[PDB]
Amino acid sequence: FVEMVDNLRGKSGQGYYVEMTVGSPPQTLNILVDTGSSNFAVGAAPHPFLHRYYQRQLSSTYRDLRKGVYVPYTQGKWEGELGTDLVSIPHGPNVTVRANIAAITESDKFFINGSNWEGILGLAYAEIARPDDSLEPFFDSLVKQTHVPNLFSLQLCGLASVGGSMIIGGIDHSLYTGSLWYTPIRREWYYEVIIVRVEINGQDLKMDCKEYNYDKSIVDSGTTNLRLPKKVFEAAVKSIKAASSTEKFPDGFWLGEQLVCWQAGTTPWNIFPVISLYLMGEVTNQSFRITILPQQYLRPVEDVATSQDDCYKFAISQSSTGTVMGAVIMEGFYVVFDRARKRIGFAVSACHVHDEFRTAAVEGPFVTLDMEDCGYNIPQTDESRSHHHH
Numbered sequence: 001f002v003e004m005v006d007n008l009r010g011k012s013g014q015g016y017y018v019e020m021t022v023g024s025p026p027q028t029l030n031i032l033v034d035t036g037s038s039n040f041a042v043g044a045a046p047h048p049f050l051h052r053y054y055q056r057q058l059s060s061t062y063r064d065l066r067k068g069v070y071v072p073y074t075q076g077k078w079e080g081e082l083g084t085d086l087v088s089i090p091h092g093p094n095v096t097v098r099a100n101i102a103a104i105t106e107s108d109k110f111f112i113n114g115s116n117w118e119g120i121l122g123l124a125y126a127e128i129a130r131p132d133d134s135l136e137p138f139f140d141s142l143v144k145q146t147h148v149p150n151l152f153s154l155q156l157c158g159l160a161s162v163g164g165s166m167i168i169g170g171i172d173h174s175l176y177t178g179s180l181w182y183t184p185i186r187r188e189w190y191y192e193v194i195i196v197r198v199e200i201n202g203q204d205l206k207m208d209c210k211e212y213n214y215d216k217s218i219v220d221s222g223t224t225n226l227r228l229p230k231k232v233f234e235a236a237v238k239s240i241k242a243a244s245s246t247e248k249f250p251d252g253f254w255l256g257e258q259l260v261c262w263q264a265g266t267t268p269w270n271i272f273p274v275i276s277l278y279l280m281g282e283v284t285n286q287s288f289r290i291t292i293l294p295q296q297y298l299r300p301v302e303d304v305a306t307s308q309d310d311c312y313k314f315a316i317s318q319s320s321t322g323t324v325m326g327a328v329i330m331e332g333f334y335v336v337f338d339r340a341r342k343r344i345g346f347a348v349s350a351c352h353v354h355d356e357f358r359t360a361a362v363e364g365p366f367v368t369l370d371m372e373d374c375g376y377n378i379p380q381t382d383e384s385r386s387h388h389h390h
């Protein structure tokens with residue numbers, strides 16, 4: 001796992017990528033690690049923000065599946081042609097596998113200026129793969145074709161350059177301190193988990209806990225922010241405003257639309273509260289908490305103008321598709337995606353962004369006598385209901 005330590009790079013707010021090779025002879029590309037989707041897709045035609053891309057004509061091992069795929073996002077899209085080719089991870093396991101690859105032939109708002117990834121590695125499950133769940137995701141081919149154990153772990157360390165580690169097939173004990181706590185993968189589609197309680201500086205938000213998981217909660221390395229369902233987000237902002245009320249920020253700040261600044265090195269970190277999300281434990285009635293510092297959810301943005309000011313963006317935002325535990329949360333922790341045991345572990349990261357008097361933490365157990373089920377059951381559409389899964 002020493003070969004895999006430090007195999008991630010990225011830019012702040014543009015995710016983390018790992019090198020991969022596609023084709024023979026191998027074409028090296030920088031690929032976004034995305035635990036919130038399930039396609040392996042690579043830029044495969046010229047684009048003004050890419051200077052390399054997968055050229056299927058140069059790969060003697062490439063085979064066309066003769067099927068297109070179209071992937072809309074709320075903010076953009078990619079589309080392309082499905083095929084298979086040999087794939088390896090130069091700073092990962094010593095193996096090569098034959099994987100599905102979507103060659104992206106057109107896209108809109110997907111490849112960003114001065115972003116240096118040329119593709120996306122969807123690490124989530126077949127159920128959310130496009131065009132449907134019969135396109136086997138990369139990690140499933142990896143595991144089926146080799147002896148790599150069915151698990152990977154991410155150490156995401158906090159435009160400024162960022163680094164981290166994806167350990168494929170293992171847990172590297174040098175990347176965390178202290179205890180490793182597991183929460184169940186509630187269902188294998190996204191990496192879905194259940195939050196049972198939320199506290200802001202030790203004060204319970206006191207919502208029905210189903211609200212925390214409406215309509216799901218997921219661990220997502222392809223999302224920058226901590227995103228929270230609307231009602232949860234409003235209660236959180238109310239509570240963070242109350243703690244920081246010595247400072248009156250504009251509304252655009254709370255929307256993530258405006259930076260706020262203090263004189264160099266003077267930021268009053270101590271007026272911003274910690275946030276603790278309690279995740280359901282492997283034992284009924286148990287939970288454990290992960291505790292986020294302001295230094296994780298206030299993200300520094302280097303000011304081209306005001307020179308000796310430290311300026312920050314608020315990186316908690318609204319969601320209408322459940323809680324999203326993005327970079328803001330993952331950057332505190334070493335996150336173990338234990339697919340074999342259908343669970344996600346959290347430990348304090350060996351690279352966490354500390355504070356004078358407080359630390360990102362993973363702590364448990366907390367027991368409740370309270371039964372309550374905090375999971376939300378998504379209303380089943382007639383479209384979902386009809387599809388056969390043979």
Ligand SMILES: CC1(C)Cc2cc(Cl)ccc2C(N[C@@H](Cc2ccccc2)c2nc(=O)c3cnccc3[nH]2)=N1
Pocket residue numbers: 013014015016032034073075076077078108109110221222223224225226227317326
């Ligand atoms: C995986 C990936 C590329 C999928 C994606 C597709 C498109 Cl078309 C536009 C943006 C994104 C995207 N957005 C992330 C930020 C990002 C961009 C590039 C690489 C990694 C992460 C995101 N995070 C938020 O917190 C967020 C919050 N609100 C709205 C949209 C948001 N979008 N992530």
Ligand SMILES: [Zn+2]
Pocket residue numbers: 051116
């Ligand atoms: Zn480059």
Ligand SMILES: [Zn+2]
Pocket residue numbers: 388389390
């Ligand atoms: Zn059938």
Ligand SMILES: [Zn+2]
Pocket residue numbers: 133134388389390
């Ligand atoms: Zn199916």
